[PDB]
Amino acid sequence: MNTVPFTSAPIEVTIGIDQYSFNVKENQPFHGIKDIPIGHVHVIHFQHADNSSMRYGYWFDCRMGNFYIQYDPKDGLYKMMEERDGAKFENIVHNFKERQMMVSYPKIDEDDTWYNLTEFVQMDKIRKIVRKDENQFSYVDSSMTTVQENELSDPAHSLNYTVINFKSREAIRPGHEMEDFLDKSYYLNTVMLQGIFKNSSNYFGELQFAFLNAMFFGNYGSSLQWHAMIELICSSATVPKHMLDKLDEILYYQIKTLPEQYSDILLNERVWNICLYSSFQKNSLHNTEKIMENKYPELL
């Protein structure tokens, strides 16, 4: 198991660590989170009690370094940093562990939620969407725009998702206008899967990362990206049967995890109704269709 230490908690803050949320009071003796399960990316995120503006957080992987959190009173946020002195680090963590100043990530042995939401997510691909190369972890927040959004404004602070646009020359072969527009299989399988992503696991990784960024930071661009990538598969007549079975599972656990009070803004009625009831793959998402009907029948 591994750990993320905090010099301190100077401002009252709601801290998130993957799908868990808990509150820290101004100057309560909090020094961090222990027993984080090795083997998965993680995300530690923040919402200041006093200013709900800007949810922000950090994507990291404990196998890539020793990371800690220290509040920066100039920039006004909890910053992630890497301690290169491994020995300084174990010493510090042991002290706080001994004094029991760390809350305990409760890994449950009948819960696969986090695995099921991050199966295809890999820190190396995150670091290509979020460009900040002198760090092994990746900052995201509420307001970061995506490359595509900055085509319709600082590029350093943007999310480089793979642009998808159904009415572009990339999506539409000359002389196959109607064919490619009503059946997107060319765009899915040759352009995106064989061309850009190389395999379906990197496509699913971006799709999952997109969803998590929407859900955890309320990032509007990420939400668009997550729907765009669902729609491209659902709108293709020809999709490997393994992709559909897996897509069904992925969405199911996304739908399962979404807070009920946030579905009116994070789910796009058009995309889902099309995908579940009109698209080529209408019959192919049984598990997703069952949880969507039973949980958010309102949306349909």
Next chain:
Amino acid sequence: GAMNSSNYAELFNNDIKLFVDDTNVYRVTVHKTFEGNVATKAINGCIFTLNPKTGHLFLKIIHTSVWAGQKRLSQLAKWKTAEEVSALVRSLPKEEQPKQIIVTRKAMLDPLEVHMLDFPNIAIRPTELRLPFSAAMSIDKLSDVVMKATEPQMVLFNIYDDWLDRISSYTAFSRLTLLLRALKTNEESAKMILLSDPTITIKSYHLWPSFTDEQWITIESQMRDLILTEYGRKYNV
């Protein structure tokens, strides 16, 4: 965006623009089969592509062979229209290409946009106007060339005959739309009005008769009365 009664003068400024109407592209007659089912039989149609400023009409004739062995014909019609328009634009020299293409029905917007991705500076737009262009097949010489056609064929016309020598495009357009609405609402009466006087005649190189200015006023008056008459008949007034 969309075109309406607020920016109605835009049609007659100096930016090349075309209307595209696909209503008469796919045309069918419906009849009973021997076994008592219903079957369709397609007939020739046409794409109606009009420059409202000059009166130039690019009448692309749609031969029934186009449909042979195809599925989902009403939807293909929209994509066949978009392809024809796109090919027409591409055959025009650059300085003759439209800046705008206005489609008369919203279902045409995506097919045309996708076919025109190569032309990112050409705006593709809907209109809130209800334009009576479906009645173009009530014009006899257009109906004639469409039904006679044995093959795909592009035929060029000026739907204003010579009117622009004497009036503005704004007025020619008004007259054309009033004539076409009349023909759509009651085609037989509309035509009677145009040939009730046997002395006035249609030049072989025209579509509409050779009315004096004074006779056009009278005609215009009679067409408005017809539309009004049909409105009353319709709603009981």
